[PDB]
Amino acid sequence: PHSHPALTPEQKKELSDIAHRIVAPGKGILAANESTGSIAKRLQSIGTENTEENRRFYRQLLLTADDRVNPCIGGVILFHETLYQKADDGRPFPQVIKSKGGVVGIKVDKGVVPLAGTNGETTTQGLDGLSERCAQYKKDGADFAKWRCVLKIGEHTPSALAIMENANVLARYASICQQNGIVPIVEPEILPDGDHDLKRCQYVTEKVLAAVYKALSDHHIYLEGTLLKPNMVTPGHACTQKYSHEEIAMATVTALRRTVPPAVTGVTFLSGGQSEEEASINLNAINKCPLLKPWALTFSYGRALQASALKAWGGKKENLKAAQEEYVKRALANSLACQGKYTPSGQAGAAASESLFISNHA
Amino acid sequence: PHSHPALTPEQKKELSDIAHRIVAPGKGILAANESTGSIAKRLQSIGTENTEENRRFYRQLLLTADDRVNPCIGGVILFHETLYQKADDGRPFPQVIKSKGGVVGIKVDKGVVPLAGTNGETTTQGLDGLSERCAQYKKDGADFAKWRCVLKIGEHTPSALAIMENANVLARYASICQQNGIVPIVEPEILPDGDHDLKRCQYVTEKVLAAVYKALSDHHIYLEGTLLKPNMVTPGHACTQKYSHEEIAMATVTALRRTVPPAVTGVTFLSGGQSEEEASINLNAINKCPLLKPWALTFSYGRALQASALKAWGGKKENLKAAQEEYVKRALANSLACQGKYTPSSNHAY
Amino acid sequence: PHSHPALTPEQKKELSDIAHRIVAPGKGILAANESTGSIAKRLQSIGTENTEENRRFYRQLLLTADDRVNPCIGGVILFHETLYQKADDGRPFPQVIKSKGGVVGIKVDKGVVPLAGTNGETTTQGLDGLSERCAQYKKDGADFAKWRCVLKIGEHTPSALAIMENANVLARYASICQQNGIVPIVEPEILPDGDHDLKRCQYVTEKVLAAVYKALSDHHIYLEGTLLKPNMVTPGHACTQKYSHEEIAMATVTALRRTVPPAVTGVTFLSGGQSEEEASINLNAINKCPLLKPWALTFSYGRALQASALKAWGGKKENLKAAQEEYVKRALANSLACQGKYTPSSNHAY
Amino acid sequence: PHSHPALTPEQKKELSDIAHRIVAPGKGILAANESTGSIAKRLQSIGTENTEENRRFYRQLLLTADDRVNPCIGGVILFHETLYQKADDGRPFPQVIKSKGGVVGIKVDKGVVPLAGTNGETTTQGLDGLSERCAQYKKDGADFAKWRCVLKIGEHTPSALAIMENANVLARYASICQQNGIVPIVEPEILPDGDHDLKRCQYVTEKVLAAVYKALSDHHIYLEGTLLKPNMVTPGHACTQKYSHEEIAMATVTALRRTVPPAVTGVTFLSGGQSEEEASINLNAINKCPLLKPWALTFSYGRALQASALKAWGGKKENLKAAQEEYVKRALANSLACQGKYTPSGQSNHAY
């Protein structure tokens, strides 16, 4: 019951200042850390070879959009490869991101692994030598990190074991990050897979988050120097009953109010299969919910920000302008949504309404 | 996991409404639930025989203070005996309390008991037949309850066992209360005894509250239908280092912000033996602290509201008026305090 | 962590000695602690009024059987009422029990209560004032106590909350008993109700017992001064698949080997609705299981020891000898069973 | 509340047979898994250059001792490098180990790392890619593994976080091993450093082992297919009070009886810095303790088996025989001790 300060006042100030800059009013996160195995399917959809140059070019396309995205993007998450690549003008991507007022993030987990004795459940690995990697990434320009755990709703899931194990490992990952001046984004994703309804997702989300913050407390984590990346509370993808955006918003904010301490600097929602438009409309409704919310409620989207741009590009170099324009459109929209000032209008492509849901392959 | 609704929409509405009424803006709680045993020493200090009549008169004196206290008192905690007594005019005390706009509370725990194998630590008893008692109390005018758990800061305390057992028994007590329409006030008091500093109190408070809310979650407690009664964060009574009210306020608000969910309707601070003036000044600083507070921050005082009144009374019925005047002044003072409008005359460092 | 001895070497020796005497080779326990409301149906089955005198007579009938039962009975559990009744010769029942070489036990729990937010799950109450009660029972002749927690196998049960809460309350009960020189018998019964199979009962039984002993550790419980009363591992009462006695024995012993520390003095199995013969045959197979068992494996039966005697009696004083004869028959059968000497006439698959 | 079998009957039988063979009556384990950095200190103590060939020669010296050690050694733990080395005749070391009746073991953890917010406490890393590593080692001749967690007795240690985290990681390691047919040896070592007495060590050992087995249960670990490598229960090194071997044995067996389920196949004690003779006398006393012990109580020594051999060798090829003789003597002495038949010649429980 004795205190052995894990961080110093200076270390706390550095972590808190970083977390606040990432989720400053009107700002959100662009999750462009897709691996080669993942980005491959993306490039394939538009019939493009999955080469290092193509991946480089595509990342450059998103990172070098006009200055209209500056007020919209507070942070950009990159994959190891991209952190060490450069734009056509020789500027390292981390430098390109910062020159536009954004903070650089890096994925540090090494994927999910199966939990023996469970019904298809998993935990995440990547703690080995994480300290040394964080210290090096910090030097190379990164200020925050990404780590994803995955849970699923079923007849016997998520189980007591899965919840406890995933909560404990997130805490370890957060502790090591903070020791190296890196803001950890805690990500306990609850998949939308299944036919459960809204209230069931809310119940599970509440139990999961209560377990996550108890674990963070046991591990002496500095919450002001962290961010939370949860799933919005929605019905199952196969649920028959329909709900409005106001209901999803109310269920989501209620779950958070019952589990997330005010000390947490911000919440950056994951789209999880929602369409570009659907993701923006819900984020907006959440920010308009009548209930009191002591934390920033913004975005951290991957495909929900790139869908239209990826299609507009098509792998054709002469379509750069068209591609970037679609990206900019979604950034501005979400910027307004994280402020509760978004109202969808006329020119909203069909690709923006397409469901980006993919059944969890396992 | 699978949900088995512990409460219906109607039941939740009831508990939430009661909780909000108690901690409404500018309002607090008067803790007058002392037992014959715990009130003994006090009547002794003013040379007054400890008889039911004298107790009834004293309680009457506090509950019948003039209307100036109405906007100050949102709740009143009574001891079993008092819940069934009447004022001179024949009105049941619960009725007197309600007519002045206050909510009636009742003490339901049965005291602390020693935890074998610990360095003098305890847990609290009172769960047996608690359901039937809450239903009976509800029928007789009570809408919220009090249950006190006690922890101590020492070389090896509070231990892992004490923190875990006290947090678990508090959840059981809360569960039973919510099934009978009674708002449970969770009170995990960490004594100020000792020579520890301010940062050590903050550390222990953070760990305790964290354990408390995890246990409330495991037991499916409806937070919006509860209140929290914690100790303020301060140095031990024997600490040689000095701190300002602003530092006490910052440490207190920071600790709560790191553990108490926004859904909790309100926080009613225990006085923990502080003087009337000290408990008021500190509550004021807490409400003026810059940090954002998603819950009401008010009072739930015992001696911090009765001290001067008990003295002015001294058992003399002729002192009624003088005694009530003292109580009215502390009620007004704390009402301004819980709003940050009272005046007697680097957060990264936490 | 730091040590703060809950017991002295003398207190430990007293508890260990008591525990060993109860489960001495060939000895078991007679569970005759049925309440008025529980023995009511037992008496109406034989058209006998449920009066204090009839209950006193029936208990006397069992407690005063001839010396043939002495070597078979190491302990007898009584209900409050019976602990203060006397046989026709004026002798207090606790004296009658001790005079035959048996240890006296007393039921101390206060029944189950519903756990809010669960699918009909419960926990057990009775801790309030338990310390004073144990001190009094000790003076009146009791050396061990009984406390029953109930768990059920279902689609979503037993839940994480039920397991944790029941395990925790059993630990509080055990701690209080040992502080008063009373040997606590830890009873986490998993009902056989349902259509689940043998493997499912073994799984749940394994998870519950692990939680029970982690709890007893956290609360500093002296295991040598305790006994365990669990359910045998069997298929659900309505399971379609059928199993042999050897299978039941293997599932039961394997489950116990994976969770019960060798320090535990003994295991006294509950009958759980099994017939008199069935309960004896299963206990016999358990003792013949070709695996190492570091603890005594005996019995603590209620109806599985009284069924025939109760019927033979039929409420007629003229059938005293006949009734006791039936009791002696089951006492001898189980005495042989707990030794693997009873005759009515690939463990990696677990 | 539902079961989803992590292992099949065939997988359980395999893990169980391996565990029993390792701790069969009269047999123990030789821990020769020192790393390059660790072995450096050992070689430097005898003025010998720390080269691979020198390490190979030394490991060979122990692995090729005469057949007298056969009934004494049930298992041999190796470091990665040694698992892929060969004897002079060209035979792989794991082949040499098996031909002499021993089971081959491999160290799989990746060392300790500091736990932030604690008073110098740590946890252990090494889970990343562990499943692939175990499958590869199994194929190459390994049947059991080693993973070491370290806890320390102090003013505020072991803390709740340290105990909980170390117990959890050990369970993760055990789970992955069993999925690959490798028997995991759970090693929660409590350091003997400090001036604490016998009672304090027993208390701490009891609380640690309780958390360890609760964690193994939560992760669905098959106990019959595991072994435990705990510290003996002794006073701290700086403890002023003196104790007999009988008191050390009683406190050790008492702590184990109160926490280790009888389903555990065996207990292989670590020497924890004790002298060669001390570790043998205590192991013998532990086996003679007048209490019921439902599991095999044997050894898993490093320096308590190599101390004299390393010195007798001195790094000189001409001293091979003299060096091997020293090793054999300790192997024979401990073989008797884990049976309670040890002798210098060569042939109140309530107070705890």
PDB file of C-alpha atoms in Angstrom, chain D residues 99-310:
ATOM      1  CA  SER D  99      20.681 -42.691 -24.663  1.00  0.00           C
ATOM      2  CA  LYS D 100      21.554 -42.365 -20.965  1.00  0.00           C
ATOM      3  CA  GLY D 101      17.905 -42.411 -19.888  1.00  0.00           C
ATOM      4  CA  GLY D 102      17.366 -38.680 -19.472  1.00  0.00           C
ATOM      5  CA  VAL D 103      14.691 -36.336 -20.833  1.00  0.00           C
ATOM      6  CA  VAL D 104      15.852 -33.170 -22.639  1.00  0.00           C
ATOM      7  CA  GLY D 105      14.856 -29.707 -21.414  1.00  0.00           C
ATOM      8  CA  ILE D 106      15.139 -26.208 -22.922  1.00  0.00           C
ATOM      9  CA  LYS D 107      15.122 -22.677 -21.437  1.00  0.00           C
ATOM     10  CA  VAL D 108      12.487 -20.577 -23.216  1.00  0.00           C
ATOM     11  CA  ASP D 109      12.038 -17.374 -21.194  1.00  0.00           C
ATOM     12  CA  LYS D 110      13.785 -14.168 -22.241  1.00  0.00           C
ATOM     13  CA  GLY D 111      14.801 -12.757 -18.875  1.00  0.00           C
ATOM     14  CA  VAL D 112      13.311 -10.406 -16.313  1.00  0.00           C
ATOM     15  CA  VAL D 113      12.151  -6.830 -16.951  1.00  0.00           C
ATOM     16  CA  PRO D 114      11.403  -4.059 -14.415  1.00  0.00           C
ATOM     17  CA  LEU D 115       7.836  -3.438 -13.216  1.00  0.00           C
ATOM     18  CA  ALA D 116       7.118   0.307 -13.164  1.00  0.00           C
ATOM     19  CA  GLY D 117       5.684   1.715  -9.942  1.00  0.00           C
ATOM     20  CA  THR D 118       7.253  -0.959  -7.739  1.00  0.00           C
ATOM     21  CA  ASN D 119      10.279  -1.048  -5.458  1.00  0.00           C
ATOM     22  CA  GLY D 120      12.679  -2.789  -7.840  1.00  0.00           C
ATOM     23  CA  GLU D 121      10.342  -5.677  -8.632  1.00  0.00           C
ATOM     24  CA  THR D 122      10.097  -7.443 -11.970  1.00  0.00           C
ATOM     25  CA  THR D 123       8.178  -9.838 -14.197  1.00  0.00           C
ATOM     26  CA  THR D 124       9.507 -12.096 -16.991  1.00  0.00           C
ATOM     27  CA  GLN D 125       9.205 -11.717 -20.791  1.00  0.00           C
ATOM     28  CA  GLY D 126       9.257 -14.298 -23.591  1.00  0.00           C
ATOM     29  CA  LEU D 127       5.714 -15.120 -24.750  1.00  0.00           C
ATOM     30  CA  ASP D 128       6.133 -13.625 -28.237  1.00  0.00           C
ATOM     31  CA  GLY D 129       6.368 -16.381 -30.842  1.00  0.00           C
ATOM     32  CA  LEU D 130       6.676 -18.928 -28.017  1.00  0.00           C
ATOM     33  CA  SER D 131       4.298 -21.377 -29.708  1.00  0.00           C
ATOM     34  CA  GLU D 132       6.461 -21.577 -32.844  1.00  0.00           C
ATOM     35  CA  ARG D 133       9.604 -21.899 -30.722  1.00  0.00           C
ATOM     36  CA  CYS D 134       8.122 -24.775 -28.705  1.00  0.00           C
ATOM     37  CA  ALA D 135       7.073 -26.662 -31.837  1.00  0.00           C
ATOM     38  CA  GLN D 136      10.596 -26.314 -33.234  1.00  0.00           C
ATOM     39  CA  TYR D 137      12.268 -27.436 -29.989  1.00  0.00           C
ATOM     40  CA  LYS D 138       9.904 -30.422 -29.717  1.00  0.00           C
ATOM     41  CA  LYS D 139      10.919 -31.559 -33.196  1.00  0.00           C
ATOM     42  CA  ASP D 140      14.594 -31.130 -32.327  1.00  0.00           C
ATOM     43  CA  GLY D 141      14.443 -33.316 -29.211  1.00  0.00           C
ATOM     44  CA  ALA D 142      13.103 -31.250 -26.285  1.00  0.00           C
ATOM     45  CA  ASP D 143      10.218 -32.526 -24.117  1.00  0.00           C
ATOM     46  CA  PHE D 144      10.015 -30.008 -21.233  1.00  0.00           C
ATOM     47  CA  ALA D 145      10.789 -26.318 -20.680  1.00  0.00           C
ATOM     48  CA  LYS D 146      12.133 -23.801 -18.168  1.00  0.00           C
ATOM     49  CA  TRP D 147      10.846 -20.292 -17.393  1.00  0.00           C
ATOM     50  CA  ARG D 148      11.998 -18.349 -14.328  1.00  0.00           C
ATOM     51  CA  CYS D 149      10.118 -15.631 -12.422  1.00  0.00           C
ATOM     52  CA  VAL D 150      11.806 -13.769  -9.571  1.00  0.00           C
ATOM     53  CA  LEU D 151      10.229 -12.302  -6.432  1.00  0.00           C
ATOM     54  CA  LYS D 152      11.976 -10.700  -3.453  1.00  0.00           C
ATOM     55  CA  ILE D 153      11.156 -10.413   0.250  1.00  0.00           C
ATOM     56  CA  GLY D 154      11.459  -6.853   1.512  1.00  0.00           C
ATOM     57  CA  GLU D 155       9.782  -4.063   3.464  1.00  0.00           C
ATOM     58  CA  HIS D 156       6.984  -3.780   0.884  1.00  0.00           C
ATOM     59  CA  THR D 157       7.661  -6.804  -1.352  1.00  0.00           C
ATOM     60  CA  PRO D 158       6.482  -9.005  -2.904  1.00  0.00           C
ATOM     61  CA  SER D 159       3.708  -6.525  -3.686  1.00  0.00           C
ATOM     62  CA  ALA D 160       0.212  -7.460  -4.809  1.00  0.00           C
ATOM     63  CA  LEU D 161       1.038  -6.433  -8.391  1.00  0.00           C
ATOM     64  CA  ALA D 162       4.250  -8.481  -8.528  1.00  0.00           C
ATOM     65  CA  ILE D 163       2.575 -11.656  -7.269  1.00  0.00           C
ATOM     66  CA  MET D 164      -0.440 -11.276  -9.559  1.00  0.00           C
ATOM     67  CA  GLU D 165       1.570 -10.421 -12.700  1.00  0.00           C
ATOM     68  CA  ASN D 166       4.202 -13.126 -12.213  1.00  0.00           C
ATOM     69  CA  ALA D 167       1.527 -15.754 -11.521  1.00  0.00           C
ATOM     70  CA  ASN D 168      -0.359 -14.757 -14.667  1.00  0.00           C
ATOM     71  CA  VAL D 169       2.647 -14.829 -17.016  1.00  0.00           C
ATOM     72  CA  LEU D 170       3.668 -18.269 -15.724  1.00  0.00           C
ATOM     73  CA  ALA D 171       0.156 -19.492 -16.594  1.00  0.00           C
ATOM     74  CA  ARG D 172       0.413 -18.102 -20.149  1.00  0.00           C
ATOM     75  CA  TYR D 173       3.775 -19.816 -20.585  1.00  0.00           C
ATOM     76  CA  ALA D 174       2.369 -23.106 -19.275  1.00  0.00           C
ATOM     77  CA  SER D 175      -0.625 -22.945 -21.592  1.00  0.00           C
ATOM     78  CA  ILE D 176       1.462 -22.449 -24.740  1.00  0.00           C
ATOM     79  CA  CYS D 177       3.895 -25.217 -23.773  1.00  0.00           C
ATOM     80  CA  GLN D 178       1.180 -27.845 -23.232  1.00  0.00           C
ATOM     81  CA  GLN D 179      -0.378 -27.031 -26.607  1.00  0.00           C
ATOM     82  CA  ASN D 180       2.909 -28.091 -28.193  1.00  0.00           C
ATOM     83  CA  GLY D 181       3.544 -31.257 -26.196  1.00  0.00           C
ATOM     84  CA  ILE D 182       6.089 -29.656 -23.875  1.00  0.00           C
ATOM     85  CA  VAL D 183       5.854 -30.147 -20.108  1.00  0.00           C
ATOM     86  CA  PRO D 184       6.243 -26.722 -18.468  1.00  0.00           C
ATOM     87  CA  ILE D 185       8.161 -26.369 -15.217  1.00  0.00           C
ATOM     88  CA  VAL D 186       6.542 -23.528 -13.263  1.00  0.00           C
ATOM     89  CA  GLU D 187       9.309 -21.653 -11.446  1.00  0.00           C
ATOM     90  CA  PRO D 188       8.238 -18.908  -9.004  1.00  0.00           C
ATOM     91  CA  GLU D 189      11.534 -18.322  -7.185  1.00  0.00           C
ATOM     92  CA  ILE D 190      11.489 -16.279  -3.984  1.00  0.00           C
ATOM     93  CA  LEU D 191      15.023 -14.970  -3.358  1.00  0.00           C
ATOM     94  CA  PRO D 192      16.726 -15.805  -0.011  1.00  0.00           C
ATOM     95  CA  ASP D 193      18.296 -12.331   0.189  1.00  0.00           C
ATOM     96  CA  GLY D 194      17.547 -10.395   3.363  1.00  0.00           C
ATOM     97  CA  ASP D 195      17.546 -10.702   7.142  1.00  0.00           C
ATOM     98  CA  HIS D 196      14.028 -12.162   7.445  1.00  0.00           C
ATOM     99  CA  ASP D 197      13.456 -15.363   9.450  1.00  0.00           C
ATOM    100  CA  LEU D 198      12.031 -18.804   8.666  1.00  0.00           C
ATOM    101  CA  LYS D 199       8.417 -17.886   9.501  1.00  0.00           C
ATOM    102  CA  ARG D 200       8.404 -14.916   7.141  1.00  0.00           C
ATOM    103  CA  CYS D 201       9.747 -16.953   4.217  1.00  0.00           C
ATOM    104  CA  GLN D 202       7.126 -19.662   4.864  1.00  0.00           C
ATOM    105  CA  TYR D 203       4.369 -17.039   4.950  1.00  0.00           C
ATOM    106  CA  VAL D 204       5.440 -15.450   1.676  1.00  0.00           C
ATOM    107  CA  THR D 205       5.972 -18.828  -0.026  1.00  0.00           C
ATOM    108  CA  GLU D 206       2.454 -19.851   0.988  1.00  0.00           C
ATOM    109  CA  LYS D 207       0.857 -16.697  -0.445  1.00  0.00           C
ATOM    110  CA  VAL D 208       2.849 -16.942  -3.689  1.00  0.00           C
ATOM    111  CA  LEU D 209       2.061 -20.596  -4.388  1.00  0.00           C
ATOM    112  CA  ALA D 210      -1.637 -19.958  -3.700  1.00  0.00           C
ATOM    113  CA  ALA D 211      -1.736 -17.241  -6.367  1.00  0.00           C
ATOM    114  CA  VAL D 212       0.245 -19.402  -8.796  1.00  0.00           C
ATOM    115  CA  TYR D 213      -2.142 -22.350  -8.684  1.00  0.00           C
ATOM    116  CA  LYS D 214      -5.239 -20.120  -8.870  1.00  0.00           C
ATOM    117  CA  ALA D 215      -3.753 -18.619 -12.049  1.00  0.00           C
ATOM    118  CA  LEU D 216      -2.995 -22.043 -13.535  1.00  0.00           C
ATOM    119  CA  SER D 217      -6.638 -22.977 -12.863  1.00  0.00           C
ATOM    120  CA  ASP D 218      -7.957 -19.835 -14.576  1.00  0.00           C
ATOM    121  CA  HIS D 219      -5.861 -20.602 -17.678  1.00  0.00           C
ATOM    122  CA  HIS D 220      -7.047 -24.238 -17.748  1.00  0.00           C
ATOM    123  CA  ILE D 221      -3.603 -25.769 -17.064  1.00  0.00           C
ATOM    124  CA  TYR D 222      -3.260 -29.571 -16.876  1.00  0.00           C
ATOM    125  CA  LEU D 223      -1.465 -30.037 -13.540  1.00  0.00           C
ATOM    126  CA  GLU D 224      -0.553 -33.700 -14.027  1.00  0.00           C
ATOM    127  CA  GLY D 225       1.399 -32.487 -17.047  1.00  0.00           C
ATOM    128  CA  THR D 226       3.503 -29.958 -15.112  1.00  0.00           C
ATOM    129  CA  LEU D 227       6.236 -29.786 -12.450  1.00  0.00           C
ATOM    130  CA  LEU D 228       6.958 -27.122  -9.800  1.00  0.00           C
ATOM    131  CA  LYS D 229      10.372 -25.544  -9.170  1.00  0.00           C
ATOM    132  CA  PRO D 230      10.085 -23.565  -5.900  1.00  0.00           C
ATOM    133  CA  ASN D 231      12.640 -22.301  -3.415  1.00  0.00           C
ATOM    134  CA  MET D 232      13.131 -24.335  -0.253  1.00  0.00           C
ATOM    135  CA  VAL D 233      11.770 -22.549   2.810  1.00  0.00           C
ATOM    136  CA  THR D 234      14.718 -21.032   4.685  1.00  0.00           C
ATOM    137  CA  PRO D 235      15.608 -17.903   6.681  1.00  0.00           C
ATOM    138  CA  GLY D 236      17.138 -14.966   4.823  1.00  0.00           C
ATOM    139  CA  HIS D 237      20.896 -14.971   4.212  1.00  0.00           C
ATOM    140  CA  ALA D 238      21.387 -12.124   6.689  1.00  0.00           C
ATOM    141  CA  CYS D 239      19.131 -13.662   9.358  1.00  0.00           C
ATOM    142  CA  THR D 240      20.824 -13.704  12.777  1.00  0.00           C
ATOM    143  CA  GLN D 241      18.685 -16.569  14.101  1.00  0.00           C
ATOM    144  CA  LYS D 242      19.842 -20.143  13.427  1.00  0.00           C
ATOM    145  CA  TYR D 243      17.754 -23.140  12.326  1.00  0.00           C
ATOM    146  CA  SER D 244      18.289 -26.893  11.959  1.00  0.00           C
ATOM    147  CA  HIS D 245      17.750 -28.846   8.734  1.00  0.00           C
ATOM    148  CA  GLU D 246      14.739 -30.508  10.345  1.00  0.00           C
ATOM    149  CA  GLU D 247      13.092 -27.116  10.887  1.00  0.00           C
ATOM    150  CA  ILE D 248      13.834 -26.093   7.302  1.00  0.00           C
ATOM    151  CA  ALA D 249      12.313 -29.354   6.056  1.00  0.00           C
ATOM    152  CA  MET D 250       9.192 -28.980   8.204  1.00  0.00           C
ATOM    153  CA  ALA D 251       8.567 -25.386   7.098  1.00  0.00           C
ATOM    154  CA  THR D 252       9.142 -26.388   3.450  1.00  0.00           C
ATOM    155  CA  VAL D 253       6.830 -29.411   3.471  1.00  0.00           C
ATOM    156  CA  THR D 254       4.203 -27.563   5.504  1.00  0.00           C
ATOM    157  CA  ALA D 255       4.079 -24.699   2.991  1.00  0.00           C
ATOM    158  CA  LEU D 256       3.772 -27.132   0.069  1.00  0.00           C
ATOM    159  CA  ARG D 257       1.076 -29.274   1.707  1.00  0.00           C
ATOM    160  CA  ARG D 258      -1.041 -26.146   2.200  1.00  0.00           C
ATOM    161  CA  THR D 259      -0.837 -24.960  -1.426  1.00  0.00           C
ATOM    162  CA  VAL D 260       0.250 -27.604  -3.970  1.00  0.00           C
ATOM    163  CA  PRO D 261      -2.580 -29.861  -5.239  1.00  0.00           C
ATOM    164  CA  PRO D 262      -1.690 -33.583  -5.145  1.00  0.00           C
ATOM    165  CA  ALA D 263      -2.352 -33.680  -8.899  1.00  0.00           C
ATOM    166  CA  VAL D 264       1.006 -31.971  -9.485  1.00  0.00           C
ATOM    167  CA  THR D 265       3.373 -34.712 -10.653  1.00  0.00           C
ATOM    168  CA  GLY D 266       6.484 -33.433  -8.878  1.00  0.00           C
ATOM    169  CA  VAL D 267       8.519 -30.742  -7.102  1.00  0.00           C
ATOM    170  CA  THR D 268      12.110 -30.029  -8.231  1.00  0.00           C
ATOM    171  CA  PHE D 269      13.790 -27.657  -5.761  1.00  0.00           C
ATOM    172  CA  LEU D 270      16.264 -24.951  -6.715  1.00  0.00           C
ATOM    173  CA  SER D 271      19.484 -24.760  -4.642  1.00  0.00           C
ATOM    174  CA  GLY D 272      19.171 -20.984  -4.335  1.00  0.00           C
ATOM    175  CA  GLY D 273      22.842 -20.412  -3.585  1.00  0.00           C
ATOM    176  CA  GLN D 274      23.260 -23.238  -1.064  1.00  0.00           C
ATOM    177  CA  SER D 275      26.506 -25.229  -0.958  1.00  0.00           C
ATOM    178  CA  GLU D 276      26.719 -28.624  -2.661  1.00  0.00           C
ATOM    179  CA  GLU D 277      26.567 -30.479   0.649  1.00  0.00           C
ATOM    180  CA  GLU D 278      23.934 -28.159   2.148  1.00  0.00           C
ATOM    181  CA  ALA D 279      21.506 -28.677  -0.741  1.00  0.00           C
ATOM    182  CA  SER D 280      21.913 -32.458  -0.393  1.00  0.00           C
ATOM    183  CA  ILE D 281      21.382 -32.504   3.387  1.00  0.00           C
ATOM    184  CA  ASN D 282      18.267 -30.302   3.163  1.00  0.00           C
ATOM    185  CA  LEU D 283      16.759 -32.272   0.281  1.00  0.00           C
ATOM    186  CA  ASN D 284      17.297 -35.406   2.351  1.00  0.00           C
ATOM    187  CA  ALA D 285      15.699 -33.831   5.427  1.00  0.00           C
ATOM    188  CA  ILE D 286      12.743 -32.725   3.326  1.00  0.00           C
ATOM    189  CA  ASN D 287      12.206 -36.328   2.250  1.00  0.00           C
ATOM    190  CA  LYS D 288      12.412 -37.636   5.823  1.00  0.00           C
ATOM    191  CA  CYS D 289       9.878 -35.108   7.166  1.00  0.00           C
ATOM    192  CA  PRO D 290       7.156 -37.093   9.031  1.00  0.00           C
ATOM    193  CA  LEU D 291       4.281 -35.647   6.986  1.00  0.00           C
ATOM    194  CA  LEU D 292       2.327 -36.967   3.993  1.00  0.00           C
ATOM    195  CA  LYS D 293       3.826 -35.763   0.687  1.00  0.00           C
ATOM    196  CA  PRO D 294       1.600 -36.647  -2.333  1.00  0.00           C
ATOM    197  CA  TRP D 295       4.237 -35.566  -4.864  1.00  0.00           C
ATOM    198  CA  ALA D 296       7.815 -36.465  -5.712  1.00  0.00           C
ATOM    199  CA  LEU D 297      10.301 -34.144  -3.973  1.00  0.00           C
ATOM    200  CA  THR D 298      13.569 -34.123  -5.898  1.00  0.00           C
ATOM    201  CA  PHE D 299      16.238 -31.731  -7.193  1.00  0.00           C
ATOM    202  CA  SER D 300      16.943 -29.368 -10.110  1.00  0.00           C
ATOM    203  CA  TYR D 301      20.407 -28.052  -9.278  1.00  0.00           C
ATOM    204  CA  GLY D 302      22.930 -25.995 -11.204  1.00  0.00           C
ATOM    205  CA  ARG D 303      26.012 -25.028  -9.211  1.00  0.00           C
ATOM    206  CA  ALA D 304      25.053 -27.476  -6.444  1.00  0.00           C
ATOM    207  CA  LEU D 305      26.004 -30.131  -9.008  1.00  0.00           C
ATOM    208  CA  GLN D 306      28.767 -28.393 -11.002  1.00  0.00           C
ATOM    209  CA  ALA D 307      30.687 -26.456  -8.316  1.00  0.00           C
ATOM    210  CA  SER D 308      33.500 -28.963  -7.681  1.00  0.00           C
ATOM    211  CA  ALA D 309      33.531 -30.321 -11.246  1.00  0.00           C
ATOM    212  CA  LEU D 310      34.188 -26.867 -12.727  1.00  0.00           C
TER     213      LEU D 310
END
